[PDB]
Enzyme design. Sequence first.
Site, PDB file in Angstrom:
ATOM      1  N   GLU A  87       0.715  -1.081  -0.165  1.00 54.07           N
ATOM      2  CA  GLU A  87       0.256  -0.123   0.199  1.00 54.07           C
ATOM      3  C   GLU A  87       1.417   1.985  -0.066  1.00 54.07           C
ATOM      4  O   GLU A  87       1.901   1.705   0.770  1.00 54.07           O
ATOM      5  CB  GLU A  87      -1.329   0.233   1.383  1.00 54.07           C
ATOM      6  CG  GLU A  87      -1.595   0.711   1.465  1.00 54.07           C
ATOM      7  CD  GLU A  87      -2.850   0.757   2.789  1.00 54.07           C
ATOM      8  OE1 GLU A  87      -2.505  -0.120   3.278  1.00 54.07           O
ATOM      9  OE2 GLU A  87      -3.807   1.976   2.836  1.00 54.07           O
ATOM     10  N   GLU A 121      -8.513  10.014   4.488  1.00 57.28           N
ATOM     11  CA  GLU A 121      -8.417   8.695   5.813  1.00 57.28           C
ATOM     12  C   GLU A 121      -9.177   9.836   7.304  1.00 57.28           C
ATOM     13  O   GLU A 121      -8.958  11.198   7.820  1.00 57.28           O
ATOM     14  CB  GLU A 121      -7.456   8.659   6.451  1.00 57.28           C
ATOM     15  CG  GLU A 121      -7.144   8.154   5.109  1.00 57.28           C
ATOM     16  CD  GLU A 121      -5.449   6.750   6.097  1.00 57.28           C
ATOM     17  OE1 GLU A 121      -4.586   7.438   6.811  1.00 57.28           O
ATOM     18  OE2 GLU A 121      -5.619   5.664   5.727  1.00 57.28           O
TER      19      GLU A 121
END
Length: 216
Positions: free
Chosen positions: A114, A198
Site C-alpha cells: 500500500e 482518512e
Amino acid sequence: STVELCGQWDTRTVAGGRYTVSNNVWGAETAQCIEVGLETGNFTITRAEHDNGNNVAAYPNIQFAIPQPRRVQELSDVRTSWTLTPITTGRWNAAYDIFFAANPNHVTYSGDAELMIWLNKNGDVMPIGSRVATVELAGATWEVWYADNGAMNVISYVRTTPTTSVTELDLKAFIDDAVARGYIRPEWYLLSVQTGFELFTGGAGLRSADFSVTVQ
C-alpha cells in the site's frame, strides 16, 4: 445530478463508469454521509460523527481500478490531478492510496503493498510506520514512512509543505522511489489508485473535486 450516500458501505460508479466513489466506513460504526456528483465524482462530506483514537474510522474515496492487469515494470506514465477543500477542525488526512499485489488472483503474504501520498492533514495524525528518510520528488519534499506489519508493506510519503491541489502529479516517481528502496517489487501488479480523506474525528465539510488518473 447528485445523491447523498449515508450507508456504511455505499458506493456509486461515476464519470462515465471510469471511477467509483465509496463511503467506506470500515473502522467504526459512527455515522457518515457524502454527497456525490454523478458526472464528476466530486464529493462533499456532509456528515461525519467519528471519534476514533489512533486508528482510522473511515476513508471515503474516489477510486480508479486498473482496467487490465499491469506490472509496475510495464508502466511508462502514471499521472493524477486532484483538488481538496480542507476544514479547520477534526483529525483527518487528505491522502492517495495505491495498491500493489504480486498475485491479482490471490492474496500473497508479504507480497502486497500500500503506497500512500499525504497532501494535507489536521490535528495530531501520523502515518503507520517508522520515519526512514526525506526525499525530493515531483517538485516537492516528502517524509518517507515505512511499516512492515506483516502481510502488507505500507509506504507513506508526507508532503512537508501541505497543499490543496496537484495537477499532473507524477505518481510513477513515487513508485520508482519505493522500488529503489526495496519496498515494491517491479513484477508486482498495480491494482488501483484512490484518493480521499482518512477520518479519525469529525470530517464534515471536507470536499474532493476534479479527480483524474492516467495510467499508460
